[PDB]
Write a protein that binds this ligand. Sequence first.
Ligand SMILES: [Mg+2]
Ligand SMILES: [Mg+2]
Ligand SMILES: [Mg+2]
Ligand SMILES: [Mg+2]
Lengths: 118, 102, 100, 57, 233
Amino acid sequence: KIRTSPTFRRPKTLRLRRQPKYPRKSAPRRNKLDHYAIIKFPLTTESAMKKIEDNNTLVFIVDVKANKHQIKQAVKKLYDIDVAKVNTLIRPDGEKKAYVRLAPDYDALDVANKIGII
Amino acid sequence: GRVIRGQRKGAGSVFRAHVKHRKGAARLRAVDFAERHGYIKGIVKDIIHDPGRGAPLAKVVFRDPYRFKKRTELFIAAEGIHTGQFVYCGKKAQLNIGNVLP
Amino acid sequence: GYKYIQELWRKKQSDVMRFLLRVRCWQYRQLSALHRAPRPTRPDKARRLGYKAKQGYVIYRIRVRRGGRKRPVPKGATYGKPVHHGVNQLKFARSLQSVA
Amino acid sequence: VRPKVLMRLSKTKKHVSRAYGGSMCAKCVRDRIKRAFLIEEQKIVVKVLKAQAQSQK
Amino acid sequence: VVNPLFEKRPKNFGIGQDIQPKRDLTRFVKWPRYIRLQRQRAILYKRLKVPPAINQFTQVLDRQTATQLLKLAHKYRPETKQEKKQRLLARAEKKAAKRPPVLRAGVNTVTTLVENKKAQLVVIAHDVDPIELVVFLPALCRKMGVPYCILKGKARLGRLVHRKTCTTVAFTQVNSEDKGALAKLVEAIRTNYNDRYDEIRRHWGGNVLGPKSVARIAKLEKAKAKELATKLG
RNA sequence: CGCCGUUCCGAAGGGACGGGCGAUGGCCUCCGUUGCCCUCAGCCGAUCGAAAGGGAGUCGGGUUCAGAUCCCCGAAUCCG
RNA sequence: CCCGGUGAGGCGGGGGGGCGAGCCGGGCUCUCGCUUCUGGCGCCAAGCGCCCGGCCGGCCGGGCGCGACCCGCUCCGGGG
Ligand SMILES: [Mg+2]
Ligand SMILES: [Mg+2]
Ligand SMILES: [Mg+2]
Ligand SMILES: [Mg+2]
């Protein structure tokens, strides 16, 4: 095996994988960003009631650490309603308002009638 | 008394050179086997004006005798150099203008 | 045996020990400033200073620059009474061995 | 177009169909094919005139 | 039958003619620091004037005497870890219903029995890392009249015992049958180490310049020898 | 305490195609996976530094008491 | 110990090849070892030798040496 290049580069050795003899923490920490903690309450303001009535949307005060993906997949769990799109914004109050726009056939005004806000 | 202006030059931070728009250190080609026992031929790609320097620089372009690659080098341009000219370097190089030899 | 290496390491002005201490010092001058040694260079002096050849005992070799302690102050200007104008010829109160 | 727009266009919109197409002008293409054939030709002439000298001498 | 297509295409590896081939450069490599360090400490051990006390470790046992030596030093190896237990068991059932002569290992024991004159032959490893551990043993053997010999390799001296490395080994006693081989070795050893101790204590090693710089002097000397060889007529 | 230093006293690449061996999941056909060698590999220095530098890709109309190239409608567009 | 350079890339001897001074096909002094008309291309092997591996001397597919002289103790130099 001749040295073709004048640069001795470090040879690559073998690298094993962690086979621990005991897990550090005993139990996996439960997911504290539950489908319920991710949606606190709705809004009943005529700035969102015109969205419900006209734009066929809903306005939730979601957790601030929530993605539009977690929101979509958690309204499709708490309310079983397919979602058109989600538009979030953090208020000066600090909470994250979220405008969820329902699929064409699903009626916001008629799922807010169900869940209580009307 | 205040550190005089002459003394304030050794620290720097104001008196450093303005090496922003400069094209690189104008240095000769390193010595290799070719340059040590024969001659190596390169061409002159261009002659540029380096800022903050009265002389012009010349991009001389050889080809690596060991790899497949075209090496660039920044010489200082002797007078009479033109573009597309051939510059030879090494021990067996002939003796004309721009022809670095021992 | 150990008293042979002991009485040998006292003739540092001899030929063999001035060759050994010099090839050692040359090789040490090429390594890092603080590096772990594989085994005690002086096994006798190490026993005398408490080194049992068992697991857990480690030997680090370390080099330190000789000379006094120049005072860390501006150019000259140690603002004070002429008593404390000394910077150059000062000495440190802890040995270079304690600094190692 | 801008550099990052080139991922949109098709290869025919980016090169002309010729040797060294869209990376060298035609004049300097022909004026390089010429110099190539001519230099290799003179290298052949000199190769001949080498053993022509070695034959007598 | 030859095919007129398979042309022969030779390359010209002249200056500037064609790219040099993937040659061998194990000489010009930039090595790691530890490699270059030990490679030029082996050179400092050729440039520096080595005192005879350290130089007396290069004159070592040959390759033919070594074989027979380890042949005799294989019948007297210490017991293993398992043989120690199986001897505690055979001693147990011995109680229910002499120590053989063996080798002897370690400097602290070899020196302490060379002073007691108990040894009959001492083998010393030629490459002890800090040489101070065996710098004195040569002279203590010569002084006590004990037949010592230097063997090449403390990693082959360390296979006699069942450890990684050993430093010295001592034959105190041997069985009847092997006393003849021991007397056929002690002769060829004492005539090679103890007899010539005067000329071993005087022989400085090292002090030899590198060939690149001894040829630059042998050339100049050659020019000035062929000067008087050619100017006389 | 730390400071100097940014390619300088360094074994500084954990990557890729192909091949051989080995395992795996399924139209176990044929691709994909990861384990081991073989082959190949330059670089130039971790990282940070611009809401005015570089930087693919959205426009019209409607709408609020306060938001619109962001919401509604209608037309597009980039990247994967 | 210091300095400069480089992806520490052909260093020192020895051998092998050609030109000229010479003695009468054989030993020495020498030197060279392949690039100067042009703004082109130039790697990732041709070739010869040796072996092996599957299907039927014939298809298929691998490896080793030469090509690309041998031997060496500092990477080369410059200081010291
Ligand atoms: Mg671990
Ligand atoms: Mg710093
Ligand atoms: Mg950044
Ligand atoms: Mg910007």
